[PDB]
Design a protein around this ligand. Sequence first.
Ligand SMILES: CCCCCCCN1CCC[C@H]1C(=O)N[C@@H](Cc1ccccc1)C(=O)O
Ligand SMILES: C=Cc1ccccc1
Ligand SMILES: [Cl-]
Length: 454
Amino acid sequence: IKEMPQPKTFGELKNLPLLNTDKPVQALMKIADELGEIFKFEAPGRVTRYLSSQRLIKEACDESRFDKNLSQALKFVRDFAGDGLATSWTHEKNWKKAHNILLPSFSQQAMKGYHAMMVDIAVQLVQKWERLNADEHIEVPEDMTRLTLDTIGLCGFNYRFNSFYRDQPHPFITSMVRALDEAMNKLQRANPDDPAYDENKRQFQEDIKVMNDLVDKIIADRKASGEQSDDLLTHMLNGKDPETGEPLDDENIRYQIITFLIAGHETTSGLLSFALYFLVKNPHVLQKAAEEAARVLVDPVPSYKQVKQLKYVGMVLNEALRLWPTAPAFSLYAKEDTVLGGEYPLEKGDELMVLIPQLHRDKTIWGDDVEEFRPERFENPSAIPQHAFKPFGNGQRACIGQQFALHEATLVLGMMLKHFDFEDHTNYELDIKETLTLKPEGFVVKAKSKKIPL
Ligand SMILES: CCCCCCCN1CCC[C@H]1C(=O)N[C@@H](Cc1ccccc1)C(=O)O
Ligand SMILES: C=Cc1ccccc1
Ligand SMILES: [Cl-]
C-alpha cells in the first residue's frame, strides 16, 4: 500500500480552486506531469483520483471491477441530454434498451447508408473554400463545426441546419452551446443559489425549452408523415429492443437526438481541427497524406470503398486523437472494494477520472518521441498494449459514434488534401479552448485550390 500524491490546497476549499480557470483539463495535465500516474483531488464533499498511466488505466478498464460514472460535468449535461446514451447509468433500463436498438445503426456496415449524406456536407465545405477570394483565410474550427453539426443533423433526423449559409448559428445551436457553457461553468460556481445567478437559471430553462421544442416537433412531424427516411430517427421510431421487446419512447428519442447533436458539434470538429493543425506544422506528413488522397480519390465524388482505402489519412487522425483527444476524460466508479495496481486500495463507490491526453503521453508505451506527430506509430497496431489508446472510452460504454466520426473525418480530410494546398500564414500558436471538449481556438490557414473539379 502507498498514499497517493495530492496537489496544492486552499484551506477549506481543498483543491477546488485549481479548476477555477478557463482551461481546467490542461491544468490537470500539468499536475499529472508533476505528480505522476495517480493523484488525489479533494473538494468540499467529494474526492476523486486522476489516472495517467497505461499500467493503472488498464486495470480501471476492467468492467468486472469498474463501471462508467457520471462525472459532475455529465450530471449537469443530463439536465438537457436526459437518459440518452452518454448521460445514462449502465444500470438504467433506457441505457441497455437504446444501446441494443442503436448499435446496428452505428456499425461499419451502416456507414454505407450515411456516406451520400456525408458527401453532401463535405462538398459544401470544399465549395465554400473553392469560392474564397485570393488571400482570404479559413477559420478552421468554425468551418469544421459547421460541417460536423450539419452531417449529424442530416444523418440524425434528415434536418438541414444549413450552417454554411450562416454567420450566426441556427437558434437551436445558440441554445445548445449556451446550455453546455452553463453546465461546464457550474463546475466552478462558488455559491450557486446566489440571486446573481437567477438570470443564468432562467436562461438555462429557456435554452432547454428551445432544444426540446425543435426536437419534439421533428419527432411528432415524422410520426405523422409515416415517411421512412433511412436516418437514426426512422431506426428509433421503428426499432424494438430484442431483450425487452420494447421500442424507445418519444421522450427518450428526444434525448438521443440531443445527445447526437452535442457530440456532432463538439467532438469530430475538434479532431478535424487538430488534424489540420498537425499537418500544417509537419509538412512532410502533409505531403504523404496529400499523395495518398490524390492516388485513392480518383473520382469527382469519393466512394465508400475509397474512404476505407485512405489508410495514412486514418493514421493521421489516430495520431491527432493521441496527442489531443477531443473528449479528454471519462469517469469510473469501483463496483466493489479492490486494490488498484497492487498499491492503491479503493472502497466500493470510489471514483476515478481517466486523463486521456496523459495516458497518450505514457513514454513506457510510445517511447521518447511522445510529443512528436508521427502517424507511422499506428502502422502495426497489434504491437500496442491493451488500453494504451482510449480516445473513444472503454468497453460497453465506449463511443457509439466511433465508426461514424472516423468515416466522416477520413472523407473530409481526404477531400481537403485532394483539393487544396494549405499555408500556416500566421505561424499559429496552439491555443486550446475547453467546452465539453477540446478545440484549437483562432486556428486560421489559407488554402490554394489545386483546381480539381467536383
Ligand atoms: C466529454 C466530456 C468530458 C468531461 C470531462 C470532465 C471535465 N471537467 C472539467 C473540470 C475538470 C474536469 C473534471 O475532471 N471533472 C470532474 C471532477 C469535478 C467535479 C466537480 C467540479 C470540478 C471537477 C467531474 O466533472 O466530475
Ligand atoms: C462524451 C460524450 C458525450 C456525448 C454527448 C453528450 C454528452 C457527452
Ligand atoms: Cl491548505
